[PDB]
Ligand SMILES: Nc1nc2c(ncn2[C@@H]2O[C@H](COP(=O)(O)OP(=O)(O)O)[C@@H](O)[C@H]2O)c(=O)[nH]1
Ligand SMILES: Nc1nc2c(ncn2[C@@H]2O[C@H](COP(=O)(O)OP(=O)(O)O)[C@@H](O)[C@H]2O)c(=O)[nH]1
């Protein structure tokens with residue numbers, strides 16, 4: 142059977158690095174990794190460097206495509222000191238490390254010849270604020286598609302990709318468990334916009350951000366592994382984030398290893414797992430590149446969309 | 449508000465024809481038009497010629513894109529006497545003339561310099577045969593997504609776009625109201641494959657043919673107009689197709705103008721309208737170009753996806 146995909150292992154994949162230079166310290170890599178993420182320079186070299194290359198091959202090529210439409214429309218030539226922004230989506234479960242992957246990718250990409258403006262946005266700030274979620278009865282469905290202002294989100298990316306000079310996104314605080322009053326992220330005609338979130342590859346009766354991506358990643362792992370990473374990160378946060386008296390989950394700091402495992406399993410069981418099964422995992426087939434991770438967080442397989 | 453779309457009227461649109469030669473007789477145009485379709489050489493010149501141009505601009509450009517992936521993968525160069533096939537989808541309601549649009553487009557495209565192999569396939573032959581539909585309780589939902597062998601359909605297009613030498617599709621008879629035993633359409637590594645059907649722009653938990661399109665059309669009209677075209681074509685078929693004694697709807701031949709209007713309204717009311725509202729119309733936002741038709745079948749507006 143022919144297939145739109147081709148599978149790789151890490152051997153096959155690292156060969157595709159070719160000449161691509163590594164522009165990252167261990168000290169710089171440190172500052173990009175999230176709690177519980179195990180990435181080192183080797184993983185960057187073998188996994189993230191081929192990837193960065195592929196994307197650069199595609200930016201050039203995907204531009205020829207918009208130029209072709211603008212030529213058809215008898216339009217101005219388009220100054221190359223502001224092309225049409227390349228949009229990259231990053232998806233996958235809570236606790237799977239989307240965050241680290243997107244920051245690493247941003248950093249690699251910004252160290253290209255152009256020195257291109259590479260911005261990074263998470264869909265967190267497009268959550269409805271708590272008071273609106275309370276209203277909609279969705280305080281226990283944060284992360285589900287309906288807990289987002291999808292329209293506001295779509296307006297943002299559309300705004301950016303259509304060549305606007307600036308666009309604003311709201312800002313989410315994990316510590317305070319809500320949207321931050323008055324806070325804005327300002328994206329100014331970047332060259333590349335990475336958009337990171339659970340459900341960014343969703344599709345629907347209306348045009349959505351997944352329709353605007355020129356390239357997508359889905360970070361994947363076995364569901365039980367991800368649960369383990371999630372529970373595990375929950376116990377760890379008892380001495381990082383939960384330890385803050387301002388933390389909306391400061392009550393959790395005091396929990397025993399065992400009470401905390403019970404709490405975290407319950408959250409997984411009722412929110413994050415159902416969302417992964419029902420909404421996120423069904424988006425995996427569309428992703429340009431799936432990064433498969435083994436129980437130790439290691440990316441050891443990849444699935445590339447050839448078609 | 450910025451928009452992924454740009455609207456045209458026919459004036460704006462016909463300007464975009466530029467130099468593009470017209471290679472069609474009135475006698476050739478005649479043989480491509482379906483019962484009730486009103487297209488003339490003027491419509492071809494003003495509407496179909498810009499369109500054909502846009503597509504040619506895109507074929508070149510979309511090839512640069514697959515070449516970029518193959519370059520990344522360190523693959524052979526790809527002989528230009530067989531690139532990766534350009535796939536065009538054509539969608540819209542029953543009775544809206546998808547058929548005519550796709551045949552016209554095929555004909556225009558095959559009269560390009562390459563003299564390219566342009567094949568045309570409708571999703572009709574991917575219906576389940578009656579006996580299987582009876583089984584699934586779907587004899588009154590022909591045309592709904594679930595009345596198709598979607599997997600078989602996906603296998604077909606995947607097969608073609610992945611460079612296979614040949615792929616087979618089954619064949620549907622309207623006259624006999626069923627799949628034709630033993631009949632095959634054989635598509636042999638075309639340059640361009642046009643895939644025409646109601647639901648070809650649908651999207652879902654699995655990778656679908658809409659994910660393989662490099663360009664799509666959606667032929668649109670006001671729903672009441674389409675009903676009128678449908679009822680109207682039904683009365684007309686009383687002396688064309690229904691007149692055949694072999695016709696599965698030969699009983700309809702004898703109906704009065706008025707009994708027939710009642711029959712056709714009922715079919716619209718119970719099958720074709722619900723499907724248009726529930727499944728087809730929700731796919732319009734993704735289409736590259738929507739062709740809007742006025743009550744006289746005339747394309748007078750267009751919506752192009754810029755993003
Ligand atoms: N303060 C706080 N931070 C959290 C919590 N959960 C996640 N985060 C932070 O949010 C970031 C996003 O985590 P998550 O949504 O699971 O996405 P991931 O990047 O795919 O692991 C992580 O780097 C965590 O540091 C939490 O419960 N409290
Ligand atoms: N024999 C027969 N042909 C039909 C019937 N309905 C549609 N057709 C043919 O099927 C072709 C497809 O029609 P339709 O499915 O409405 O698609 P359209 O091309 O968008 O109008 C048309 O050209 C008709 O000639 C029918 O009831 N009997």
Ligand SMILES: CC(C)(CO)[C@@H](O)C(=O)NCCC(=O)O
Pocket residue numbers: 235265280281282283284285339408412
């Ligand atoms: C992606 C976010 C930031 C939002 O869902 C996720 O990490 C989160 O906040 N989850 C918490 C789910 C809950 O406890 O309401």
Ligand SMILES: CC(C)(CO)[C@@H](O)C(=O)NCCC(=O)O
Pocket residue numbers: 542572587588589590591592646715719
């Ligand atoms: C697209 C097809 C050919 C199949 O739905 C359509 O024109 C059709 O056959 N409609 C008939 C619906 C019905 O009477 O069962």
Ligand SMILES: [Cl-]
Pocket residue numbers: 264289338339340341
């Ligand atoms: Cl999301």
Ligand SMILES: [Cl-]
Pocket residue numbers: 571596645646647648
């Ligand atoms: Cl279909």
